[PDB]
Amino acid sequence: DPEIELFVKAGSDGESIGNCPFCQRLFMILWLKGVKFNVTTVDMNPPFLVYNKELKTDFIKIEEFLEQTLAPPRYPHLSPKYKESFDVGCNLFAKFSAYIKNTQKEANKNFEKSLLKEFKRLDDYLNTPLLDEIDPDSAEEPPVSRRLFLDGDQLTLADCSLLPKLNIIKVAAKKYRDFDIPAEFSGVWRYLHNAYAREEFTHTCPEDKEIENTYANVAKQK
Ligand SMILES: O=C(O)c1cc(S)ccc1[N+](=O)[O-]
Q1: Where is this motif: G-site?
Q2: 86 lines ligand 1 (CB under 6 A)
Q3: Residue 56, C-beta contacts closer than 8 angstroms, at least 6 positions apart
Q4: Any residues with CB less than 8 A from the CB of 141 and at least 6 apart, and which?
Q5: Which terminal residue of the chain has fewer beta carbons within 10 Å of its beta carbon, N or C?
Q6: 1-79: CATH, from 3.30.750.24, 3.40.190.10, 3.40.30.10, 1.20.1070.10
Q7: DSSP assignment letter at 206
Q8: Does ligand 1 lie within 6 Å of residue 89's CB atom?
Q9: Which ligand 1 atom is nearest residue 87's CA?
């Protein structure tokens, strides 16, 4: 295979994995490709990629590049089967971003509700059986989805995008707003339990502190 170096943002010691959810997304893509690569952290905007001596910089170009040039059969395809696997998480980070930046405590419930509404949209998607889901015993569509991840039972590009952002939301909102993702979002929790069991996700996460540091001067209410 090719010679690859991924440059990611460094954490507060200038060495550890810092909070950069697109860097984690690319780290996941390369890991899931099953390709050799090195990861370098930068105490400097990341991620950047060196692929056979060429510097690449535009994330979208990079993601397209990798999916197209690291292809089957040597490498797994990572594009999701269903376009909505991508589309479901579209406003979730923005709602979190407004919630975590709000400094008016009496507005907290309104911003939290707006975040919960997006989590509900995600939960519904994760509970709705995909068109390809067939119960192995009855051959009926299951009544509630059982698939591991967004698109099916493998990690896809959808998950490499969404998972890093959900980790940030989970960590930062718990730290600064005492927020827990409701237990009643059983679809969301099944997905998170499955994801946190995969090392491509957990071992590319920065330490929670790095994410807490990102929000330390925005999330304190006044
Ligand atoms: O980067 C985002 O905020 C994001 C945007 C869209 S349109 C879909 C999924 C996403 N995920 O997964 O994070």
Answers
A1: 20-23
A2: yes
A3: 48, 49, 50, 62, 65
A4: 129, 133, 134, 135
A5: C
A6: 3.40.30.10
A7: P
A8: yes
A9: 8
User: What technique determined this structure?
Assistant: X-ray
Protein fold of 80-222: Glutathione S-transferase Yfyf (Class Pi); Chain A, domain 2 (1.20.1050)
Q: Is 15 annotated as a binding-site member?
A: yes
- Take residue 200 and report the two structure tokens written for it: 């491509």
Q: Provide the residue type at 191 as one letter.
A: Y
Nearest CA to ligand 1 atom 12: 162
Q: CB count, 10 Å around CB of 22?
A: 19
For this entry, resolution in Å reads 2.0
CA of 197 to the centre of ligand 1 (A): 22
Q: Is the CB–ligand 1 distance for residue 93 below 6 Å? A: yes
Contact 109, 177 (CB under 8 A): no
If you take atom 13 of ligand 1, which residue's CA is the nearest one? 162
Report DSSP state, residue 156.
-
- The CA-CA-CA angle for residues 23, 27, 31, to 5°, reads 170
Q: What tokens does 161 get? A: 């995008």
Alpha helices by DSSP H, the chain: 21-33, 59-69, 84-87, 92-101, 108-127, 157-177, 186-196, 199-202, 208-214
Residue 188 token pair: 């969301």
CB distance 185 to 123 below 8 Å: yes
